[PDB]
Amino acid sequence: DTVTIRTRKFMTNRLLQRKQMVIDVLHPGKATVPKTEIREKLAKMYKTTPDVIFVFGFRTHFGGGKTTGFGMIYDSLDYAKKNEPKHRLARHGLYEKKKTSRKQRKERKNRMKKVRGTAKANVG
C-alpha cells in the first residue's frame, strides 16, 4: 500500500559485479519494515530476483517518517557467494557457522600445543 522505496546513491561496481546503492523507505504509519519485504519491493524495481539482492544497515529517524539503509544487487548468485561478508549469507541461509565458541578452540589450541607430532589430532 503506502510504502515506497527510492534509491539515492546509485553506483555499479564492475569490480565487485554488483549494483551498490542506498535505500530510502517511506513507512509513515507502520513499524520499521522487515528486510524480506523491502527485497520484494526492490527486486521488482530493478527486475532481478530477490534471491540475489542483499540489504543491511537500516535506520529509522526520529518520528518514523523514513528509514535509510544500504543495498547491493549482484549480477549472479555465484558472485554474491564470493563477494559478500559471510554473516550476510547466514541471514539468507546460505552459510553455516560452526557452533564452537572462542574459548572452546583456544583451550584446545593450547592443549594440542603440548603434544608432539602424532597425537596432536587426538586432543579434542
Binding site: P28, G63, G64, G65
Partner: protein, 180 residues
Amino acid sequence: PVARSWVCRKTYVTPRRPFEKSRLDQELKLIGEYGLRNKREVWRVKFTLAKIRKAARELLTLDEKDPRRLFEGNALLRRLVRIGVLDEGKMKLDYILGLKIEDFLERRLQTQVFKLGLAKSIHHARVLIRQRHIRVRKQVVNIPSFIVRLDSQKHIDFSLRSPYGGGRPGRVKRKNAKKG
C-alpha cells in the same frame, strides 16, 4: 587507546554572587515570561550571548580592512540574521553588542508555538513539543530549546500522527468510547 572522542563543552556558567535580589528577580521574570524549567536554562542563553559578544569584541579591536574581520565577521553577522535576531537593515558588527537575552528566547520553539497561536499558553507549548505534537516541515521535534531559523518559521504544524493534526486519538478518547 580507543576509538572514542572525548570533547565536550559546558553550556552555562554559574554567577559570581549567589544571592542578590536584583539578579534573582530579573532571572525569574524571564523564566515566567518564557516558561523555562530552571535557572540553568537562563544561564545557558546568557552564556551563549556571552560568547557571541566576546567574539565580536575582538573583531572590533582589529583593523576595519583586516580580512579576518571581513570574513569571520560577515559570518557571525550572517548566522544571527538566519535565526531572526538581527535584521537586514542592522547587519553591521556594531549592533551585535546591542543584543539582549530575550532577543534569543523569542526564537525558542517553546515560545514560537505560543506566539503562533498553536498553544494557548506559554506553559501549554512546552507540553505539546515534549508531547510530540509539533513538527518542523517533516520532523517531529521533541525539544523546546530549538532555535527556529527565519525561513524555518512560517511552516510549523501539528505532526500528522497527532490527535490534533491527523486525528487518531490517544489513550483517553479511546477508553471513553469503550463504555458507551
